[PDB]
Amino acid sequence: EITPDLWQEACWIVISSYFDEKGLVRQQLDSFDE
Amino acid sequence: EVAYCSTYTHCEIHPSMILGVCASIIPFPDHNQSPRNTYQSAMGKQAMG
Amino acid sequence: AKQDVIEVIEKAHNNELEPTPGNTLRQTFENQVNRILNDARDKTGSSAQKSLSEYNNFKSMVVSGAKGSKINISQVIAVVGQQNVEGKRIPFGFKHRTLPHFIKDDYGPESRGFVENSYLAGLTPTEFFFHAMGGREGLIDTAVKTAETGY
Amino acid sequence: NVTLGVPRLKELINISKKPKTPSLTVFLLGQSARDAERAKDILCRLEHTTLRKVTANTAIYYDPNPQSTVVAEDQEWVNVSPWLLRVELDRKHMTDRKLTMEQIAEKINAGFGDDLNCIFNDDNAEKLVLRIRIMNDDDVFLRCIESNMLTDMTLQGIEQISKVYMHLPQT
């Protein structure tokens, strides 16, 4: 079911998951690992 | 109300994710003249802490 | 003003827009839109001026001449206005559009950079980015002027 | 189109042969100062106009006999090297400057002399056309003129002038 007008709270859960999964310097660590 | 696009393919997660690291600590950067935002981005790297 | 710009766009798309002296069809369309939006910004600013109370502290600092101009009051209170880079409206950086959020061949006010909000009401993200684009020109010109005039 | 500011100050400070915008302000004297049409006449006397600016389309043919042309123009009948070049002139660009095909043919023959002759239409005709031939690699000769005459020949104005505006000043 869709999420109308609840999206302020839901818009930031995905951002928090993104910054938990990936740090802020991920483009450096991934490049050096590769 | 009268369709502008009606054919969207993607959606911004949050429009404020266009800012960087120093520019995203500014409160209400959309109420500031942009050079002031740039100057804070430059000065936020000089703040003691 | 937005409705007038829309009508001008309709006339241009219908080939009803008459080329003004010297200018071409596309150039006269750009001049028409810029004229309409300049009128909008100036008129809104002027209406803002007359609404300020005698105790308004922007007015005290503008009529004294110490710091600021009536254009700053206009931008803070009424509307910020058109953001230009190299003297033209925001260019089609992408293929025939200024940002991914707009539709191809969209010459409307907000599609090409006209900021319709005031600094008190805040800027929509698209026009926030357009305002940053406009403001980068000042920094670039300052940085080159400093080195070009001393010689 | 004014190049003012620090760049202008630099250009003046260091006398140079190629400022970013060389210009003239030309004041008119008699009826040309009083009437827009008469001023336009002088503007056309000044602005460099080449055969290309009046040309609409250029085509090169091989026309076996003038009396039985391969193109539907009968000026060739009245006029009196089957390798033929035909230029058709735009009436808008011709009457922008009161140019007449008499002048066009005069300048063409003045430039290319006797070896190349032109058969012009009349300025009122439905299509302004010039039938041109060499007078005894003819194909590449006509192509060479197709390039040079269009790009290089002068019909009106003076060289070194790119364009000329007309103005009712405010200052």
Add this chain to the structure above:
Amino acid sequence: DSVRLKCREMLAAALRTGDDYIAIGADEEELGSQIEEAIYQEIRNTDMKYKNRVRSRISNLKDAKNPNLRKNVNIPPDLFARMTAEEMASDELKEMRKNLTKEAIREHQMAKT
């Protein structure tokens, strides 16, 4: 020389187009021979260096969108031979088109602001 003869014969041949000379009922050979003289007495070189006059008069008499010029020859030849625009101002439709073209170009060769 025969140079004058042939070209004024061709002028006469141009005057007769459309039988307009017969509808009006006028003799056009005299008119052609007089038109060539009126041209020569202004372009007074033996070979008629500017015979653009004679050929343009021929063609413009033969111009089917301005048959009224062919009808007129009441403006006499002495005037016809000198006319600017090769007398096609009488066409009054091409003349209007040229007038409007001049109206446009007066505006489209001006400053930006």
Add this chain to the structure above:
Amino acid sequence: PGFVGIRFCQECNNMLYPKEDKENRILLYACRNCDYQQEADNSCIYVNKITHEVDELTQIIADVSQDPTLPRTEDHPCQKCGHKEAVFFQSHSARAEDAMRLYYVCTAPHCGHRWTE
């Protein structure tokens, strides 16, 4: 006025060049690498549009109808098949002399109709 393109030598598929026949007074085509003489049927050799009016309508392609970043209007029903939905855009061609004219493509598969108003 036409537009004369390239023609190829059948014997070696090299480009043909025109040549006047000075005996029978006719135009022929020839090849520099082959003694192949064939007869022309156009009588025109070279053309060049200087004003260069060109039909942008033809270079429109039916595939653009599915572009997601293109404005859509049912206010201009298809002239061919009557389908309401049409995508509209400007010429998109550089060197366009001076124009903002619109071109419409029908949003119906296998109609693929491109038209101008």
Add this chain to the structure above:
Amino acid sequence: IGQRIVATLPYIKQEVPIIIVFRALGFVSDRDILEHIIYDFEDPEMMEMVKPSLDEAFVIQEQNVALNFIGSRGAKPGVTKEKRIKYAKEVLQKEMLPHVGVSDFCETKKAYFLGYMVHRLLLAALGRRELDDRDHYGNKR
């Protein structure tokens, strides 16, 4: 006369007209070349633009002659013409356009991509396609 297309191949100090390059890649016939440069013969507009380039190279037909022509302009033009031809072949094989393969038998891949480049140059010259922007970030790594 006008509108000649040239090619500034690497390790060749001068430029070289393109059709010499194509006949160096082994495409002798003009049609067998143009079908890599003009995918649609419906366009007299396209053909008449590249046509002067085909006019210029009407004195180079044999492939090894094309290689020698390329070799003569090479940075190391050994007086021995055999090694000039070998140098041109090395250029075209491995130093020219590596991303389209650098084996000896990739001539058709390199020819198709070079034809694509020439075709897009023609499109940009016809004005059918807008010039690329050097500031677009899709053009940056």
Add this chain to the structure above:
Amino acid sequence: PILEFLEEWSMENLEEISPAAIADATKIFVNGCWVGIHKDPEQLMNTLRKLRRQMDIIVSEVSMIRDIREREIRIYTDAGRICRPLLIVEKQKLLLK
């Protein structure tokens, strides 16, 4: 992997193409290498995007670009390309429920 998936689909190999058959057919570019022709690009684009949303052949970094007016599909797998994440919107609705 992308080359294998493209070749096992309805492509025409560039080296097996008829030169006249490139006119009415889109050109596929993998990392800039013109590598094949496709008669129906609207199937290839949807198949490639479906694959990317499942993380099976096309990894999430790869980007398939469809140029409509100029028939060209360009797929990039090389490094250094800067990208950012966005929600997907197939109807006038989020896939994020």
